[PDB]
Amino acid sequence: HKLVPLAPADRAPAVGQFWHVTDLHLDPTYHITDDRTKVCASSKGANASNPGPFGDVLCDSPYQLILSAFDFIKNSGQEASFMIWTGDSPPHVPVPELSTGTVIKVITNMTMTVQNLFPNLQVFPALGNHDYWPQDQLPIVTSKVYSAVADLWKPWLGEEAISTLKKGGFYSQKVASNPGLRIISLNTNLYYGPNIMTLNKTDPANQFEWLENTLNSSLWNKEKVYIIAHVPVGYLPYATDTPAIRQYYNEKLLDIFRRYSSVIAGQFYGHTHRDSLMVLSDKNGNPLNSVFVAPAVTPVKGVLQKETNNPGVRLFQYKPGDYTLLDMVQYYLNLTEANLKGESNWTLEYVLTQAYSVADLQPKSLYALVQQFATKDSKQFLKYYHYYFVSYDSSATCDQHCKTLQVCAIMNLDSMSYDDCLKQHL
Numbered sequence: 454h455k456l457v458p459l460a461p462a463d464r465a466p467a468v469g470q471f472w473h474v475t476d477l478h479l480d481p482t483y484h485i486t487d488d489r490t491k492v493c494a495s496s497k498g499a500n501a502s503n504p505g506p507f508g509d510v511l512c513d514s515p516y517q518l519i520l521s522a523f524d525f526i527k528n529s530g531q532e533a534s535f536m537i538w539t540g541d542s543p544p545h546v547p548v549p550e551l552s553t554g555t556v557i558k559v560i561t562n563m564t565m566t567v568q569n570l571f572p573n574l575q576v577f578p579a580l581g582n583h584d585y586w587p588q589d590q591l592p593i594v595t596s597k598v599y600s601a602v603a604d605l606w607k608p609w610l611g612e613e614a615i616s617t618l619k620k621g622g623f624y625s626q627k628v629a630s631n632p633g634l635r636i637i638s639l640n641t642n643l644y645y646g647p648n649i650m651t652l653n654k655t656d657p658a659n660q661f662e663w664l665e666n667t668l669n670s671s672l673w674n675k676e677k678v679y680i681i682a683h684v685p686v687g688y689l690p691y692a693t694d695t696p697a698i699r700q701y702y703n704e705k706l707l708d709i710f711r712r713y714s715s716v717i718a719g720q721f722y723g724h725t726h727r728d729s730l731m732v733l734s735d736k737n738g739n740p741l742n743s744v745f746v747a748p749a750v751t752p753v754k755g756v757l758q759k760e761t762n763n764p765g766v767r768l769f770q771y772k773p774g775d776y777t778l779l780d781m782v783q784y785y786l787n788l789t790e791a792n793l794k795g796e797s798n799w800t801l802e803y804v805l806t807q808a809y810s811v812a813d814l815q816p817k818s819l820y821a822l823v824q825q826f827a828t829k830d831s832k833q834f835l836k837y838y839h840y841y842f843v844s845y846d847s848s849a850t851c852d853q854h855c856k857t858l859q860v861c862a863i864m865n866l867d868s869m870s871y872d873d874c875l876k877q878h879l
């Protein structure tokens with residue numbers, strides 16, 4: 454009778470779970486019509502290829518598609534303690550067809566959709582490069598869009614988070630359901646090539662200084678951190694020697710992450726609309742940090758592209774109170790199948806540990822996997838390349854040059870190591 458906190462009953466080890474959704478790209482104009490050049494503004498005058506109620510590969514997301522993704526989550530039977538949402542809500546239309554008010558309108562719509570369906574779920578958003586008007590021009594001082602999302606996302610964020618969000622589009626925030634876990638939501642659009650507003654700035658919106666201080670505080674307060682952002686660090690895996698953010702910023706951000714690798718238990722990005730892994734390593738090739746790029750809900754592609762993604766959403770498993778990543782479950786919609794019969798069947802695509810026969814998502818485990826990808830005719834890599842497009846096309850092939858680009862980007866996030874990998878493997 455000493456009022457002792459009740460000790461857990463010895464049982465099978467519980468795991469925590471959270472959702473990651475990204476790149477919704479709602480197109481409010483979507484509607485089926487005979488003139489296929491009028492199905493969606495986002496096809497920019499192209500004929501929709503084969504449109505249905507859940508969308509088209511040349512179009513951004515019909516509302517019904519986004520709705521079906523969130524209804525799948527809600528009825529999935531999966532318990533989750535939070536969700537990360539890494540941005541990009543307006544669709545791909547020319548700048549003159551949007552405005553600041555319209556951008557805010559679409560972000561509001563996506564935010565309220567989530568809040569209505571998931572009223573008890575803490576959500577951690579990050580801004581995407583399309584979450585501003587004109588696109589990509591995210592500023593280094595406060596702005597209407599920053600002020601708007603600060604209000605929209607107040608239910609999820611504390612006063613501190615709201616203040617930094619309003620100033621620069623970034624924040625950190627303790628996870629109410631998970632003591633000892635902090636989310637750091639970066640505005641990596643400040644580092645994105647097309648952003649005129651940050652040309653020649655060594656530390657736009659002071660995000661690097663803020664990030665270094667935030668991580669140091671977490672290190673000393675014994676927290677763990679999940680980093681989330683829209684545009685990823687590292688190299689585009691389909692292009693040669695092309696960093697996803699400006700090289701100066703990539704190198705500087707990576708050095709921070711390497712220095713605080715003991716505190717960072719995960720990094721989660723979108724923007725590419727593909728399913729990609731990266732492993733941050735030191736200069737000598739030792740793995741330090743696992744990086745997960747998540748595919749988009751939208752299936753949009755340009756006419757010039759051959760492949761695109763199926764819609765996807767994903768879920769992570771972690772060790773409770775510790776926050777080590779245990780597994781990832783990717784879900785998807787076979788878009789063609791769903792448009793043909795008119796009914797969504799969001800379903801399991803793969804479970805990372807089972808697909809690749811790894812114990813967990815720790816850097817050394819993923820590093821060992823990717824050194825398998827490097828082997829000639831690796832069946833593991835073939836699977837990875839199938840999932841890269843979220844199983845859009847099992848006959849898509851990756852020739853020697855393509856695979857070199859993929860594997861080099863998976864393993865080498867900084868310029869010196871990426872270039873050395875090209876020297877050895879081109």
Ligand SMILES: *[C@@H]1O[C@H](CO)[C@@H](O[C@@H]2O[C@H](CO)[C@@H](O[C@@H]3O[C@H](CO[C@H]4O[C@H](CO)[C@@H](O)[C@H](O)[C@@H]4O)[C@@H](O)[C@H](O[C@H]4O[C@H](CO)[C@@H](O)[C@H](O)[C@@H]4O)[C@@H]3O)[C@H](O)[C@H]2NC(C)=O)[C@H](O)[C@H]1NC(C)=O
Nearest residue numbers: 763786787788789790791793802839843844845846847848
């Ligand atoms: C998401 O959902 C879609 C639609 O259900 C699935 O796509 C279908 O997949 C099946 C099986 O993979 C395909 O059936 C086979 O197609 C092969 C031809 O490939 C292309 O060529 C046709 C030619 O008209 C194109 O129209 C089309 O785009 C195909 O991509 C054929 O070789 C097969 O014929 C053989 O099948 C059996 C033998 O096993 C025999 O019955 C036949 O006589 C013959 O020997 C077969 O036709 C089907 O074409 C696909 N449909 C579409 C619209 O692409 C995806 O697989 C699914 N995604 C995932 C991840 O499962």
Ligand SMILES: *[C@@H]1O[C@H](CO[C@@H]2O[C@@H](C)[C@@H](O)[C@@H](O)[C@@H]2O)[C@@H](O[C@@H]2O[C@H](CO)[C@@H](O)[C@H](O)[C@H]2NC(C)=O)[C@H](O)[C@H]1NC(C)=O
Nearest residue numbers: 487488489490491492496497498499500501502503504756
């Ligand atoms: C968009 O498509 C229209 C319609 O073309 C037809 O439908 C397509 C889905 C496909 O089946 C084509 O083979 C068809 O021709 C295009 O307009 C057609 O263009 C050709 C060439 O002038 C002509 O034979 C048709 O009569 C045209 N119109 C119709 C109603 O068929 C239109 O050019 C396409 N737009 C773009 C930007 O590609």
Ligand SMILES: *[C@@H]1O[C@H](CO[C@@H]2O[C@@H](C)[C@@H](O)[C@@H](O)[C@@H]2O)[C@@H](O[C@@H]2O[C@H](CO)[C@@H](O)[C@H](O)[C@H]2NC(C)=O)[C@H](O)[C@H]1NC(C)=O
Nearest residue numbers: 662663664665666667668669670671672673674675712713
């Ligand atoms: C990172 O933080 C350490 C720890 O300092 C503490 O950090 C928080 C707990 C907060 O409460 C701060 O006010 C604390 O001081 C810093 O280490 C300090 O370094 C200074 C020299 O600059 C030294 O005089 C102090 O004695 C150190 N404190 C301890 C406890 O060792 C460190 O400077 C910070 N690193 C960076 C890059 O800012």
Ligand SMILES: *[C@@H]1O[C@H](CO)[C@@H](O[C@@H]2O[C@H](CO)[C@@H](O)[C@H](O)[C@H]2NC(C)=O)[C@H](O)[C@H]1NC(C)=O
Nearest residue numbers: 481482515516517561562563564565566567569
């Ligand atoms: C987000 O936008 C969608 C589409 O613009 C809204 O859904 C439509 O709302 C109007 C009602 O004003 C109806 O006429 C349509 O039939 C609705 N459905 C579709 C598929 O267009 C949706 O209500 C908006 N959500 C929020 C929270 O504002």
Ligand SMILES: [Zn+2]
Nearest residue numbers: 476478541724
């Ligand atoms: Zn996007």
Ligand SMILES: [Zn+2]
Nearest residue numbers: 545582583724
């Ligand atoms: Zn884009």
Ligand SMILES: [Zn+2]
Nearest residue numbers: 541581582724
């Ligand atoms: Zn983007």
Ligand SMILES: [Zn+2]
Nearest residue numbers: 693854855879
């Ligand atoms: Zn080449």
Ligand SMILES: [Zn+2]
Nearest residue numbers: 694868871872
């Ligand atoms: Zn280079």
